[PDB]
Design an enzyme around this catalytic site. Structure first.
Site, PDB file in Angstrom:
ATOM      1  N   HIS A  40       0.805  -1.210   0.000  1.00  0.00           N
ATOM      2  CA  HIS A  40       0.000   0.000   0.000  1.00  0.00           C
ATOM      3  C   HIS A  40       0.854   1.283   0.000  1.00  0.00           C
ATOM      4  O   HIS A  40       0.316   2.358  -0.184  1.00  0.00           O
ATOM      5  CB  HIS A  40      -1.058   0.008   1.114  1.00  0.00           C
ATOM      6  CG  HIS A  40      -0.574   0.436   2.478  1.00  0.00           C
ATOM      7  ND1 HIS A  40      -0.201  -0.460   3.469  1.00  0.00           N
ATOM      8  CD2 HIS A  40      -0.452   1.674   3.033  1.00  0.00           C
ATOM      9  CE1 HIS A  40       0.148   0.212   4.556  1.00  0.00           C
ATOM     10  NE2 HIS A  40       0.002   1.508   4.325  1.00  0.00           N
ATOM     11  N   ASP A  84       0.063  -7.575   1.789  1.00  0.00           N
ATOM     12  CA  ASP A  84       0.508  -6.175   1.798  1.00  0.00           C
ATOM     13  C   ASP A  84       2.005  -6.117   1.944  1.00  0.00           C
ATOM     14  O   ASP A  84       2.553  -5.823   3.005  1.00  0.00           O
ATOM     15  CB  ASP A  84      -0.182  -5.394   2.891  1.00  0.00           C
ATOM     16  CG  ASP A  84       0.047  -3.919   2.828  1.00  0.00           C
ATOM     17  OD1 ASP A  84       0.511  -3.455   1.754  1.00  0.00           O
ATOM     18  OD2 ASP A  84      -0.309  -3.193   3.814  1.00  0.00           O
ATOM     19  N   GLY A 175       1.964   6.891   8.508  1.00  0.00           N
ATOM     20  CA  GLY A 175       3.343   7.297   8.270  1.00  0.00           C
ATOM     21  C   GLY A 175       4.376   6.284   8.744  1.00  0.00           C
ATOM     22  O   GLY A 175       5.520   6.317   8.297  1.00  0.00           O
ATOM     23  N   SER A 177       3.578   3.086   8.105  1.00  0.00           N
ATOM     24  CA  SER A 177       3.253   2.100   7.077  1.00  0.00           C
ATOM     25  C   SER A 177       4.479   1.643   6.330  1.00  0.00           C
ATOM     26  O   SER A 177       5.288   2.460   5.914  1.00  0.00           O
ATOM     27  CB  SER A 177       2.334   2.763   6.003  1.00  0.00           C
ATOM     28  OG  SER A 177       1.054   2.946   6.492  1.00  0.00           O
ATOM     29  N   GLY A 178       4.590   0.336   6.147  1.00  0.00           N
ATOM     30  CA  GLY A 178       5.715  -0.204   5.410  1.00  0.00           C
ATOM     31  C   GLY A 178       6.936  -0.535   6.248  1.00  0.00           C
ATOM     32  O   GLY A 178       7.837  -1.238   5.772  1.00  0.00           O
TER      33      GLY A 178
END
Ligand SMILES: [Ca+2]
Length: 223
Positions: A40, A84, A175, A177-178
């Site tokens: 994402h 994801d 923020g 994320s990942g």
């Protein structure tokens, strides 16, 4: 990261910031050429920023390297966030030393109760918004599959796990994320999703990296 602590500069040496004119996601360096992040977080024109602490100040340990290619998981579903995960290749190899280092992939999946370190430059508030400049850290346990499913009925796949605190107050957030979830020196999770941040009974949901090691290795070997 809500309810965490300031990591300390370059204490999380595999943490990267994905930049497209601004920080927009975390990631994890897994070898000199490759970063793991969330699907994402996909966009074109990514610059990977390694060696970061304050993302708004050049402090002396940065390596800024553009991505040459991004590979979203073949089965990523952006509606459910199943699968994801995304790989990003660097145009040149990062220089590895103690402040910029890869993180090992798991050889086994982690169990509920294992303690992990979650990190990022995301929002530090559960209501309203404050983005830190320096890297934030949170120690949190993996939660049972049953508690995860009970928290998010109909939403948790075999490619996800929950981690954090059902009481609320401590979680990853927008923020982050990942970015990484590292347990006993292995990358076991990727910051994926949750309902708000740090809300009661709504823990963080993370991509279950151990399911993807085969795909990661074969993808790197041919790209
Ligand atoms: Ca910096």
């Amino acid at each position: 990261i809500v309810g965490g602590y300031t990591c300390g500069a370059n204490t999380v040496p595999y943490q990267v910031s994905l930049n497209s004119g601004y920080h927009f996601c975390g990631g994890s360096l897994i070898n000199s050429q490759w970063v793991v992040s969330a699907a994402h977080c996909y966009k074109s024109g990514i610059q990977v920023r390694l060696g970061e602490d304050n993302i708004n100040v050049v402090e002396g340990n940065e390596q800024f390297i553009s991505a040459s290619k991004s590979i979203v998981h073949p089965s990523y579903n952006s509606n459910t966030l199943n699968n994801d995960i995304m790989l990003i290749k660097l145009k040149s190899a990062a220089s590895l030393n103690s402040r910029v280092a890869s993180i090992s992939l798991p050889t086994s999946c982690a169990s509920a109760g294992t303690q992990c370190l979650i990190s990022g430059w995301g929002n530090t508030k559960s209501s309203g918004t404050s983005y830190p400049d320096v890297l934030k850290c949170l120690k949190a346990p993996i939660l049972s599959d049953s508690s995860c499913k009970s928290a998010y009925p109909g939403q948790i796949t075999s490619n996800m796990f929950c981690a954090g605190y059902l009481e609320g107050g401590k979680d990853s957030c927008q923020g982050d994320s990942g970015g990484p979830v590292v347990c006993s020196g292995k990358l076991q999770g990727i910051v994926s999703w949750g309902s708000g941040c740090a809300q009661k009974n709504k823990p963080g949901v993370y991509t279950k990296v151990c399911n993807y090691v085969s795909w990661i290795k074969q993808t790197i070997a041919s790209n």
